[PDB]
Design a protein around this ligand. Structure first.
Ligand SMILES: [Mg+2]
Ligand SMILES: [Mg+2]
Lengths: 147, 145, 148, 144
């Protein structure tokens, strides 16, 4: 009859599910990721995805920017999880005083490129021959969103 | 009389001073493991160039992020160009494919410098650095060995 | 009178001599096939006395901080410490290049190379038994490593 | 459970197994490769791949092995059946030695190969650079 999708800050009970999801795409993780700001997408009563944010560097001059990372579960594909997370982060950023969101995406990653551009991100960088992968060099883009 | 070679224990008190113009035991403990090549005119430290990969990523280890410092008393002597040309040769043997660095949109003379020596623009980061109420642009420049 | 030994990166001029040497240990065939390669040369007087060649053991990114090494010394420049001087130079070069580890493989029967590498601080990391097939028989091989 | 070489019909499920452990790029990538697949009732349970470790003539009596097993088909002894199969195949192909490399941290692969008679030949220290840290590797061998 109905479905519900909730996005909220990560809670203690989430970590078993998060640790599990991060493997698909124990307490060391739980320690590591409490230095980290994570928001969680809950579909019904299951973890469907997360968005994680942190300033791109430790520089004070960088503290008004969030580098972002999205993870969507293999069991919650194609239900707008990615977009709901982006929308929520843009709203959180506005109140947090964050001026700018960014991330990097591999040139060959057409789906991510289209996703972020669809969500109003613009290309700021084309890093050519940027990453060495098994004998070849791969290009990378940086995308930005202005709150 | 220009000799470029790697850093020695003799260079550290002279290198600490050129750093101030852009604690003495704190700096030698921060710069200890670092790859630093030093420029010597006569028997004086004219400048330096520091290189490290941009990140710890394995996929990034064929790239050098570079840092150049030139002494106030050694301007116009082409110290920068000699340092840079030296690192391009070193890169070629170290297996380094790409050189990069970032420069503030306002540092017009660093931009000119890097353009003059064959670097091309790869990034224009808008409103990137927050400085006293204002946002400032950054550029990334790259050189392909 | 006086004797000089210099080690430096290979130069276009060296290639005729390098070609002739590798035939013991043409113009473009050897020269381009080895143009991408990182080769250093030992020059004794102004003749080519030997070389050391280095590259990562594989193309994997995770392997890019290691050099697999090969040394060649001329039959006309035996027993004058060329091998050791090349080894010393490469270890210093690796330190500036950010290279963490040197390695190579040596046939179990090659007692002199074993002694040479062990003398130069390389430690055995592998004993590959019955590893190479050679005219009816299987031969063992070691891997040696040096930690910069 | 049936073990046979790869067929021209196995590629949509075999590529699918790879992503967990492009279909046009992958079929092309594994065109001429020696692969045996484990089938549990018209279902792809696992696979084993073998090639000489190098192009050296002197290495041609050796197989480097790679094993993959489906997430659905764990604990079914699929791994062991593939190995046992390749041990018998090696015997007739004239292969003298089987080998592979295993990360020091992959305890469960090490136990697996040890259980099936492989012995350690190498311990490569600080061998793989991974995000700022260096990681050990082992080589394991089986003698036919
Ligand atoms: Mg919105
Ligand atoms: Mg030495």
């Amino acid at each position: 009859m109905s479905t519900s999708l909730t996005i909220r800050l990560v809670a203690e009970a989430d970590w078993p599910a998060l640790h599990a999801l991060d493997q698909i795409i124990l307490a060391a993780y739980q320690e590591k990721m409490k230095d980290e700001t994570i928001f969680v997408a809950i579909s019904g009563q299951q973890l469907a995805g997360f968005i994680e944010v942190h300033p791109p560097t430790s520089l004070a001059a960088h503290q008004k920017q969030w580098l972002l990372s999205i993870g969507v579960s293999p069991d919650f594909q194609d239900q707008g999880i990615g977009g709901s997370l982006l929308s929520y982060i843009k709203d959180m950023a506005e109140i947090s005083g964050i001026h700018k969101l960014s991330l990097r995406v591999m040139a060959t990653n057409q789906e991510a490129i289209r996703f972020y551009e669809k969500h109003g991100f613009v290309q700021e960088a084309h890093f050519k021959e940027e990453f060495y992968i098994n004998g070849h060099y791969c290009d990378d883009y940086q995308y930005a969103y202005f709150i």
